[PDB]
Amino acid sequence: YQKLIVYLCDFLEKEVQKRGFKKVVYGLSGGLDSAVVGVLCQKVFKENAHALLMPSSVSMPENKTDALNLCEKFSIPYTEYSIAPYDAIFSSHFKDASLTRKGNFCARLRMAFLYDYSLKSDSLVIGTSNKSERMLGYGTLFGDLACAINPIGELFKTEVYELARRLNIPKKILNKPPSADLFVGQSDEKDLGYPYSVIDPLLKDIEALFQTKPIDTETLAQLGYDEILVKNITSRIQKNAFKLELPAIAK
Amino acid sequence: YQKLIVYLCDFLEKEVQKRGFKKVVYGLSGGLDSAVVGVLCQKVFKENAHALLMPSSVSMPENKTDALNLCEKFSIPYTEYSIAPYDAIFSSHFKDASLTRKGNFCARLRMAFLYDYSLKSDSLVIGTSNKSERMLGYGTLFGDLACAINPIGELFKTEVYELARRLNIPKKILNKPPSADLFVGQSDEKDLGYPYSVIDPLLKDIEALFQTKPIDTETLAQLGYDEILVKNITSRIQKNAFKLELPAIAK
C-alpha cells in the first residue's frame, strides 16, 4: 500500500493542476472514506486543501467530533456549516418524506455548498466514493458522487479501509462500522444485509470476468458464491449502472 | 424540422423505457428550452409527463405565468413549488454572495426537487440544456445540466428556437430574449456580448473542423470570423469542457 499512496498523491497533483487550480475542497463527514481522501489531499496541498463539515438535523454529534479530531491531527483547515435549517424546511413541506428522500436531499445540499465553496475560493471538488460503493449503486447521484476528481473510486471498500491504516487514520474511524449516514441507526451492513468481506470478493470477480458482457449468476456460483448473494448484488449493479454513466443525449 | 420532431420523440420513448420507467419530470422555467422539451414529452407520455415550476425569490412572476399558459395549452400536469425560503436562508448566511453564487445554488435546488420528485413518483429527469449552451459552458454543473436524458442537447440554440415554431410554442416564449434567469436583468446576449446568430454559426464550424484537435484561432479567421469573437468563444469552450465530461478517477 505504500506504493499505492504515492500513486494517489501524484494523481491528485496532476489532476487539479491540469485544470488551473492549486486548492481543493471536500466533504468531511468523519468517516473512513472522507478521512482517507482528506489526508491524501493534505499531503499534497497542505493548507491549500480544505475540508467542509456539513452536519444535518439528524447527524451524530460524535462523528463531527471525529472529523474535528482528524483535522486537528493533520493540520487540515476547515469550515463548519450545518445544513439543518435547510432540511428543516424540506420537512415542514414534506412530512411524509421517506428516509431515503431526506437522505438524498441532504447529500445534494452538501454538494451545493462544496461547489459554492469552490467558486468563491477557486478550488476543485474531490469525491470520496469508493469502488464498492459505486458498483453497488449505493450513492447519491449529483450528491456525494458529484465531484471533479476522485482518488479512491477504483479502490474497493476493503482496499480502502486497509489503505487508511497505512495512512495512520485515527482508529476510531477504522473500527467505525460502515454507514453512509442519512438518518438514524443506518449502516451499510444493514440495508445491504452483508459485510464487505462478503461483498467485495465477488465484485473482484465480477470486474474480471464480465468486463463488458452481461453478468451470469450461473457461472458465478461455480466460482463459489451464495445464490442469493449473487442474484442480489448482480441486480443492484445493473439497477444503478446509470449513475456512473453520462446522461443520454440524442446524437 | 417535422422529421426532427419525430426523431426526438422516438428518442424519448426509447430512453425512458429502457430504464424501467413510464413517467418523466422536468423543470419548466417558462423559457424556450424548457417549453420545447415539455411539449415533446407531452406528445409521448401525455399525463405521464410532469412539469415542475420552481420559482425563486428573484424569479419574474411573468415567466411563471407563461409556464402556466404553456401547460394549460398542451394539458401538461404540473406542481408549483417555490425555492424562495431556501435561497432566503442561503442569503442570511451569505450576504456577500455574488450573483453567480446565488444563481448556482438555486439551480442545484431545482435539481434536488426534480430528483426527489422522480424518486416518489417513479419518474426520470429530462434535461433541457441546448447544444450552444453546453459548448459555451453556460450551465450549472449538477444543476440544470443534471438529468438522465436530454432530447435537445445536440441542437444549437438556433435550431432549438426554430423547432419550437413547428411545435406551435406560444409566441410569447419565442420573442422572449435569451436569459438563463439567475437574478435581475440577466440575459445571455448580455453576459456573452453577442446574439446567437453570431455565436451559433461559429460553433457549427468548430464542431466540424476541430473534432478532436485543439482549436486554432488563425484557421478560424480565414473562414470569416471576428478576431475577438473567435478568441472569446474558444476560451469559453476550453474553459468549460470539463462540465460535459465524467469526473476524473484514478484507474
Side-chain angles (χ1 to χ4, degrees), chain B residues 188-205:
Chain B
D188 292 51
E189 208 182 315
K190 292 180 64 62
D191 61 70
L192 300 167
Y194 329 88
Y196 283 111
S197 31
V198 176
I199 309 175
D200 285 40
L202 174 50
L203 307 172
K204 294 181 176 185
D205 292 312

Side-chain angles (χ1 to χ4, degrees), chain B residues 170-223:
Chain B
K171 292 190 173 189
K172 184 56 182 59
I173 310 299
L174 310 170
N175 282 51
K176 190 176 299 151
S179 170
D181 234 64
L182 295 171
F183 40 77
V184 183
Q186 193 195 188
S187 177
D188 292 51
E189 208 182 315
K190 292 180 64 62
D191 61 70
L192 300 167
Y194 329 88
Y196 283 111
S197 31
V198 176
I199 309 175
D200 285 40
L202 174 50
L203 307 172
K204 294 181 176 185
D205 292 312
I206 297 185
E207 188 69 305
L209 295 169
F210 323 84
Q211 179 60 87
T212 319
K213 45 182 60 193
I215 296 180
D216 181 298
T217 46
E218 163 47 68
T219 176
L220 277 177
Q222 295 194 61
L223 289 190

Side-chain angles (χ1 to χ4, degrees), chain B residues 1-59 61 63-230 232-250:
Chain B
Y1 285 80
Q2 285 287 175
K3 206 67 170 174
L4 167 57
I5 289 169
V6 180
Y7 174 69
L8 301 204
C9 275
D10 223 274
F11 172 72
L12 280 179
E13 204 204 27
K14 276 190 236 292
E15 295 305 304
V16 172
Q17 179 176 283
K18 81 208 303 152
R19 281 166 183 60
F21 301 79
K22 322 204 306 293
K23 280 177 279 184
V24 291
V25 59
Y26 54 101
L28 210 247
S29 66
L32 188 57
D33 284 6
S34 282
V36 175
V37 164
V39 176
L40 291 165
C41 281
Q42 186 291 301
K43 300 194 71 187
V44 186
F45 307 102
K46 320 295 172 167
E47 280 181 64
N48 285 293
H50 205 261
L52 291 185
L53 284 67
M54 292 154 295
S56 79
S57 293
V58 298
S59 295
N63 277 153
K64 173 163 71 191
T65 3
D66 289 319
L68 285 183
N69 271 209
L70 174 72
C71 292
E72 195 213 292
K73 208 273 176 167
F74 297 92
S75 311
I76 298 179
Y78 62 88
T79 295
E80 249 187 293
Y81 187 75
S82 121
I83 56 179
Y86 292 81
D87 55 55
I89 300 293
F90 175 76
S91 303
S92 79
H93 292 185
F94 287 140
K95 304 185 64 61
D96 301 304
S98 64
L99 302 169
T100 302
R101 287 185 55 194
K102 308 185 107 71
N104 293 350
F105 188 63
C106 291
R108 269 158 192 140
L109 289 152
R110 290 184 177 100
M111 173 284 284
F113 297 111
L114 273 165
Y115 269 86
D116 166 82
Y117 183 92
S118 52
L119 167 53
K120 65 175 173 79
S121 62
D122 302 277
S123 287
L124 280 174
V125 185
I126 305 188
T128 65
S129 0
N130 68 56
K131 198 190 199 333
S132 311
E133 276 186 303
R134 291 165 66 77
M135 280 172 90
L136 291 166
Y138 192 57
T140 307
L141 178 67
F142 310 136
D144 56 305
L145 293 153
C147 68
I149 299 157
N150 193 329
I152 77 304
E154 278 302 317
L155 294 170
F156 297 101
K157 188 78 203 176
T158 47
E159 307 192 316
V160 174
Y161 162 75
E162 224 300 285
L163 148 64
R165 249 166 95 304
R166 189 45 56 189
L167 285 184
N168 289 303
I169 292 294
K171 292 190 173 189
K172 184 56 182 59
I173 310 299
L174 310 170
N175 282 51
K176 190 176 299 151
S179 170
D181 234 64
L182 295 171
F183 40 77
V184 183
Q186 193 195 188
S187 177
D188 292 51
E189 208 182 315
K190 292 180 64 62
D191 61 70
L192 300 167
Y194 329 88
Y196 283 111
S197 31
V198 176
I199 309 175
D200 285 40
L202 174 50
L203 307 172
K204 294 181 176 185
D205 292 312
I206 297 185
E207 188 69 305
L209 295 169
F210 323 84
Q211 179 60 87
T212 319
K213 45 182 60 193
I215 296 180
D216 181 298
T217 46
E218 163 47 68
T219 176
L220 277 177
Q222 295 194 61
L223 289 190
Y225 290 90
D226 179 19
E227 197 65 65
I228 299 179
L229 189 280
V230 162
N232 184 298
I233 291 179
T234 299
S235 177
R236 279 284 241 149
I237 298 178
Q238 314 166 303
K239 186 166 182 105
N240 295 271
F242 84 91
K243 294 185 183 191
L244 315 169
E245 272 166 1
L246 286 160
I249 303 155

